[PDB]
Amino acid sequence: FIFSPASGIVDKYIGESARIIREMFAYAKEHEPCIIFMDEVDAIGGRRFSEGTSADREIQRTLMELLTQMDGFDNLGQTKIIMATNRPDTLDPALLR
């Protein structure tokens, strides 16, 4: 197990917050079977946005990284996602997929 809180994988440095989550799927393929519990995700749950602040394209960079992992030429595995959220209609519908 890990784990990842919604907001301790978020970093100030960009391409550093992509780094953890890419490398945390890597870990999952050596230490397999694995369960990846995302806890109380609403942080990068956010939609396309980016008519707001710069925060919302920080969300966007980190979200795109998850999709190539989940389904891509990167394939899984014996790695499992358990995603815990407190309201699911916050989410981007590409995380309802």
């Binding site: 391409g15 550093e16 780094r19 394209r57 960079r61 795109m64 999709l67 030429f73």
Partner: protein, 197 residues
């Protein structure tokens, strides 16, 4: 004597453009731009357009060159990997199937078919739609079927992580594609990379 300066260790810059046949502009990947002498009796045919290159460590000078094949962002993901979905996961999606076999498959089998009729070839393919529609699925289906070279990059493989990292990663993927041409470059999502605003 002149072989010892061609030898290890070396730092890798990137050559921008010449100003001369024995003086060039290179950008080091240390985030410093240098105007540097170039060694005579190297070949310059691949040098003058941008390409990876070896620069000496302490002095900083263009002392040897590298081939464009090596110093790739990520290698071919199409001879050292093989697609994992065929056209047996396809049944339906035939509307897109008439347009994809024109677009991807026809310049690989022979580019010259276009040329001799006197239609100039279409460019790039954008696939759009909810990602649940099997866009991604179709790319893997025709790739297993054509069995040409394929590249698996993503924007989290072009992403900035130190200074001047991110433009270098862009230049390298096309350089590789042309060397073993023809080739299909796949970037799975450009959602982050490009934003309307």
């Amino acid at each position: 004597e002149v072989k010892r300066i061609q030898s290890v260790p070396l730092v890798i810059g990137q050559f921008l453009e010449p100003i001369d046949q024995n003086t060039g502009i290179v950008s080091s990947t240390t985030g410093m731009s240098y105007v540097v002498r170039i060694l005579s009796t190297l070949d310059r045919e691949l040098l003058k357009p941008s390409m990876s290159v070896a620069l000496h460590r302490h002095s900083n000078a263009l002392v040897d060159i590298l081939p464009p094949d090596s110093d790739s962002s990520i290698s071919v993901m199409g001879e050292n990997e093989k697609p994992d979905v065929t056209y047996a996961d396809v049944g339906g999606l035939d509307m897109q199937k008439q347009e994809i076999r024109e677009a991807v498959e026809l310049p690989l089998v022979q580019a010259d078919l276009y040329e001799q009729i006197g239609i100039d070839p279409p460019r790039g393919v954008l696939l759009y739609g909810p990602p649940g529609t099997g866009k991604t699925m179709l790319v893997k289906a025709v790739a297993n079927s054509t069995k040409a070279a394929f590249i698996r990059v993503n924007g989290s493989e072009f992403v900035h992580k130190y200074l001047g990292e991110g433009p270098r990663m862009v230049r390298d993927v096309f350089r590789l594609a042309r060397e073993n041409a023809p080739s299909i470059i796949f970037i799975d999502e450009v959602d982050s990379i490009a934003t309307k605003r």
